[PDB]
Amino acid sequence: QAPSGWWLANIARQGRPAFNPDPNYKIFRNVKDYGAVGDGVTDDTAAINAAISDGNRCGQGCSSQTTTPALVYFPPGTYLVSKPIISYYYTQLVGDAISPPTLKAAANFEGMAVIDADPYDENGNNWWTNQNNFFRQVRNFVIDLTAMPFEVGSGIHWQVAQATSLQNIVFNMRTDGGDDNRQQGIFMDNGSGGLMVDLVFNGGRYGAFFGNQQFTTRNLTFNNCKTAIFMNWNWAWTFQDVKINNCEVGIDMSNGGPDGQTVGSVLLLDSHITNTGIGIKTAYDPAQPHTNGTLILDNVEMTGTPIAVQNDATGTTIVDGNQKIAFFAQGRTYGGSIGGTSGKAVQTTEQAIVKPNVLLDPATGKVFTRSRPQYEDVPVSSFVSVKANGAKGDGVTDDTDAIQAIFDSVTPEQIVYFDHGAYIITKTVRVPPNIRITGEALPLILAGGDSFFKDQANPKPVFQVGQPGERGRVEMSDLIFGTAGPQPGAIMMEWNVAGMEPGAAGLWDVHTRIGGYAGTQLELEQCAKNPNITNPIKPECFGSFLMLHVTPGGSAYLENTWYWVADHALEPEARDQQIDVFNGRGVLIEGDGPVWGWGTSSEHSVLHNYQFNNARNVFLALIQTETPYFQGNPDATQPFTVNPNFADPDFATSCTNSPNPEQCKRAWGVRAINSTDVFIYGAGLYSFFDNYDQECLKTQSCQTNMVSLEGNSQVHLFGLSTKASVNMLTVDGNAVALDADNRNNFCATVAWFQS
């Protein structure tokens, strides 16, 4: 087939990783330039894998790396492959967005999967630790297994961590063979997601075989699968806008049986299960001693599906189908008339969860969603390259004025294009309220300098997105924000603009990465941990002040946004060793929004990872946090001074009369102050250490408190999972839900809290 004319195939290639010392390293690889024919009859396996591996990238024997990104582009066509496509560390596999190409498995295909994102060597060891397998894309493909035997075949071995996405993929599999069909679209053994959007699964034994700590996956369609979704294990998983059609089972979450359930929790929102034998198979019963198998249904239709929820241990129909299920919860609930202050295990349908109309799509009544923009219809001439217009991107030159002038000059029908590189910013960049910005394979934008961002007593925004009260369209995609050296006064992004319509103001595949990699000066040599000594809290190891601030009047749509403070060093020489980086605050949301956050994560800040202050109209699904591993050496009262202009938590005061004072002074997972109409559909809020020691895991007591609701907040929490916090949820200083009352298979889990 002809070239599509998609801008990405043609835009001038001027990108280069600033901290790769090879001046000839090529970020962009078109597989046909490596000899792929794309006719569906020539074997293209070698050419595709060569396009990925070229340039001494992070493969076997490489723990991780950030200086060898690649964007591997597949023009329209059909690519016959007979061995796995091995996606090296930090690879974007980008099929043509206008006419997604087919990856066609040969009849005699051999290997784990058509795409393997984490191979196993002959010793059974992964190339990369699954929890460290960050910063990936696979987008715009048809994966066709129908020439393979019905007894074998997997589309993608998707064993990955955060800042990863599958987007716009069709999986075509065989429908014959009965119980002997074993094809599956995704095979996932473990990991720590992550986002998936806009997937279609046709046929196979399993649309997806899933196992992961946590994931957010929305707009998935399953047609004619035996089981659409086999949930092998998890701690939490949020599905939204799932369409299951003519399957035997929709979601199987009964693995392990009633005395060994390995699925922690599942949430299913805004979905439809059609012409399916059993909608959801579960082993949960409210008389069980634990919370494993927690399930939330919210706005799920069950057309032509006679059994909506079945207990497959007893064979008993829990919920009848052929109706709309407004709300269903099984697991433990707190608050309101049902659970109260002590909590109660339930398995019941109940009243609809009414959500503010400003959060909803008016055409569907579902919570509003929008996938990462690829600008299919924008001609290449509308793209304004920052490097063509005076920015150097070399990680040393001050690019502030050039970037500001570009932002001031572009008109709304253009798109600012960040060529790959590292762009040093030394004072506030004012982003206008009508702009579109997209990056070449996660370019770095780094707050640098030696004064402007140095003062935690006088913090300053790095990117100031709109001025207060402005409204328009601001879209950013495929970027990383960080610091060049310590910048403890940097507010990485201050979000003032509001979208003219839902989704018109937002971030997609935009991450904040504080420390840990080449260019930050915050790596193993500077910031290695030392748990045996009282932490000196080196000034050279500070991060930023606050990674994201949605101010009053601001409104944003966030999807696949990882707000990460480095727990360990990422270049291969560091061998994943752990470091101390002191970053004050994660995500702070204020005002009436709305704010949507799909597949966001915020990890390892000192004071809090998410905080809402005087906020309304917040929808997050699902969220994930971690406490920094060095606490409590130092504890959360250091090294950031309490600043009431940000409603900072004051642990010295809040922990004074704590009955668990030894670990009270620890970062909040979620803190809500005077905030209402906040909805959280799925949360994994984890505390894994005390001064790098994990003894506290044995007694689920690495910290005292994890979620705080304060000042008459009204927050709706669904599928709240926490790890090793004595109190899961505290209201006005009073512990409400305790870990010991809600034990799951690893975390503790509350199905439903409403205030």
Ligand X SMILES: *[C@@H]1O[C@H](CO)[C@@H](O[C@@H]2O[C@H](CO)[C@@H](O)[C@H](O)[C@H]2NC(C)=O)[C@H](O)[C@H]1NC(C)=O
Ligand Y SMILES: OC[C@H]1O[C@@H](O)[C@H](O)[C@@H](O)[C@@H]1O
Which positions lie near ligand X, rule CB under 6 A?
A: 168, 170, 198, 200, 219, 259-261, 288, 290, 292, 745
What string marks each residue from 436 to 475 as x (binds ligand Y by CB under 6 A) or -? ----------------------------------------
Closer to ligand Y by CB, 252 or 567: give it.
567
Among ligand X, ligand Y, none, the one that 568 touches (CB under a kind-dependent 5 to 8 A) is: ligand Y
Specify whether the CB–CB gap between 637 and 651 falls below 8 A.
yes
Among ligand Y, ligand X, none, the one that 198 touches (CB under a kind-dependent 5 to 8 A) is: ligand X
Closer to ligand X by CB, 364 or 641: give it.
364
- Return the residue of 45, 137, 168, 192 that touches ligand Y, per CB under 6 A: 192
Stretch that binds ligand Y, among 139-147, 251-259, 318-326, 562-570 (CB under 6 A): 562-570
Alpha carbon distance 629, 694 (integer Å)? 10
Stretch that binds ligand Y, among 138-146, 150-158, 560-568, 666-674 (CB under 6 A): 560-568
Nearest distance in Å: CB 67, ligand Y: 18
- Return the residue of 198, 241, 603, 710 that touches ligand Y, per CB under 6 A: 603
Among ligand X, ligand Y, none, the one that 603 touches (CB under a kind-dependent 5 to 8 A) is: ligand Y
The single residue listed with the structure tokens 């579109």 is 436
Specify whether the CB–CB gap between 147 and 43 falls below 8 A.
no
Among ligand X, ligand Y, none, the one that 219 touches (CB under a kind-dependent 5 to 8 A) is: ligand X
Nearest distance in Å: CB 267, ligand X: 18
Among ligand X, ligand Y, none, the one that 259 touches (CB under a kind-dependent 5 to 8 A) is: ligand X
- Return the residue of 104, 272, 454, 568 that touches ligand Y, per CB under 6 A: 568
- Return the residue of 132, 255, 467, 754 that touches ligand Y, per CB under 6 A: 132
Q: Can residue 590 be called a binding residue for ligand Y (CB under 6 A)?
A: no
Q: What is the 3-state secondary structure (H, E, C) of 84-138?
A: CEECCCCEEEEECCCCCCEEEECCCCCCCCCEECCCECCCCCECCCHHHCCCEEE
DSSP 355-421: --GGGB-TTT-SBP--PPP--TTS-GGGEEETGGGT---EEEEE-HHHHHHHHHH--TTSEEEE-SS
Burial (CB < 10 A; 0-12, 13-18, 19+), residue 37, is middle
Q: Are β-strands 316-320 and 307-311 bridged in parallel, bridged antiparallel, or unpaired?
A: antiparallel
Nearest distance in Å: CB 132, ligand X: 24
**Dihedral in degrees, nearest 10, Cα atoms 636, 642, 645, 646:** 0
Alpha carbon distance 254, 263 (integer Å)? 7
Distances (CA, A) of 337 to 372, 752, 755: 40, 12, 10
Q: Can residue 567 be called a binding residue for ligand Y (CB under 6 A)?
A: yes
The region, left, alpha or beta by phi > 0 then psi within -120 to 50, assigned to residue 614 is left
Nearest distance in Å: CB 128, ligand Y: 10
Alpha carbon distance 494, 424 (integer Å)? 18
* Beta-bridge mates of residue 78: 39, 102
Nearest distance in Å: CB 130, ligand Y: 9
Q: Are β-strands 608-626 and 340-350 bridged in parallel, bridged antiparallel, or unpaired?
A: unpaired
Residue nearest ligand X, CB atom distance: 260
**Dihedral in degrees, nearest 10, Cα atoms 130, 131, 137, 143:** 30
Nearest distance in Å: CB 626, ligand Y: 5
Specify whether the CB–CB gap between 460 and 544 falls below 8 A.
no
Task: Provide the residue count of the chain.
Answer: 755
Closer to ligand Y by CB, 129 or 641: give it.
129
Q: Nearest to residue 389, comparing CAs of 364, 368, 366, 414?
A: 414
Among ligand X, ligand Y, none, the one that 288 touches (CB under a kind-dependent 5 to 8 A) is: ligand X
Among ligand Y, ligand X, none, the one that 745 touches (CB under a kind-dependent 5 to 8 A) is: ligand X
Q: Can residue 382 be called a binding residue for ligand Y (CB under 6 A)?
A: no
Stretch that binds ligand Y, among 63-71, 256-264, 563-571, 592-600 (CB under 6 A): 563-571
Alpha carbon distance 441, 382 (integer Å)? 19
Nearest distance in Å: CB 742, ligand Y: 21
Alpha carbon distance 159, 169 (integer Å)? 17
Specify whether the CB–CB gap between 728 and 738 falls below 8 A.
yes
Which residues lie below 8 Å from residue 241, measured CB to CB, with a gap of 6+?
218, 219, 220, 269, 270, 271, 366, 369
Q: Can residue 571 be called a binding residue for ligand Y (CB under 6 A)?
A: no
Q: Can residue 580 be called a binding residue for ligand Y (CB under 6 A)?
A: no
Nearest distance in Å: CB 251, ligand Y: 25
Alpha carbon distance 364, 371 (integer Å)? 16
Q: Can residue 131 be called a binding residue for ligand Y (CB under 6 A)?
A: yes
Q: Can residue 626 be called a binding residue for ligand Y (CB under 6 A)?
A: yes
Among ligand Y, ligand X, none, the one that 192 touches (CB under a kind-dependent 5 to 8 A) is: ligand Y
Nearest distance in Å: CB 567, ligand Y: 5
Closer to ligand X by CB, 230 or 284: give it.
284
Which spans of this chain sit near ligand Y (rule: CB under 6 A)?
A: 131-132, 192, 564, 567-568, 603, 626
